[PDB]
């Protein structure tokens, strides 16, 4: 639950 | 063009690969509960808000990328 | 209230913890080349485009979250 990760790319999320 | 796993309906393991049309610049995958979606998508609109509303879902994790066939299930743990 | 690591300038290891004002709802961390940023931030604006333009950086990875002191370097 709510976090974001990313690049480019690349996106990674909650 | 960009090639994504893209299943009209949620599937436990989609292996249907398409050339997404030019309008779509990314491949999505997302688990919402036990349900799994694999789609041609737009990077701008890859985030919790855009994905939840567009797929009518409350709670999910998502991944998006721009390499061919990158939206496979093991991308989410 | 939200507590983030927040260093006015990029540092290899930011140890400054701040009470972000209520205008900020997230903690960011991003590696841009060898540089590392740790900031109070807004979730709306946590994405490649918003982060690169707001920090004047070409290539980076970023992570945002909302728990106290969550934006530490091992998150990437
Ligand atoms: Zn730089």
Numbering used by the authors:
A (entry chain G): 2 to 15
B (entry chain A): 0 to 76
C (entry chain C): 0 to 75
Quoted from the paper:
In contrast to its role inhibiting MAC pores, CD59 may be hijacked by cholesterol‐dependent cytolysins secreted by Gram‐positive bacterial pathogens, which use CD59 as a receptor on human cells to promote oligomerization of toxins at the membrane.
Crystals of CP‐06 in complex with the ectodomain of CD59 diffracted to 2.4 Å, and the structure was solved by molecular replacement. In the crystal structure, two CD59 molecules sandwich a single macrocyclic peptide, with three sets of complexes in the asymmetric unit. Together they create a large antiparallel intermolecular β‐sheet, in which the two copies of CD59 are oriented in opposite directions. The unique geometry of the d‐Tyr1 within the cyclic peptide facilitates the β‐turn at the tip of the hairpin, consistent with a known role for d‐amino acids in structuring short β‐hairpins. Despite an extensive H‐bond network with backbone atoms, there are no hydrogen bonds between side‐chain atoms of CD59 and CP‐06. Specifically, the CD59:Y62 side chain intercalates between the peptide Trp3 and Trp5 residues and explains the significant reduction in binding when either peptide residue is substituted for Ala. Despite a lack of sequence homology between CP‐06 and the β‐hairpin binding motifs of C8α and ILYd4, CD59 residues CD59:F47, CD59:Y61, CD59:Y62, and CD59:E58, which dominate the CP‐06 interface, contribute to both MAC and bacterial toxin binding modes.
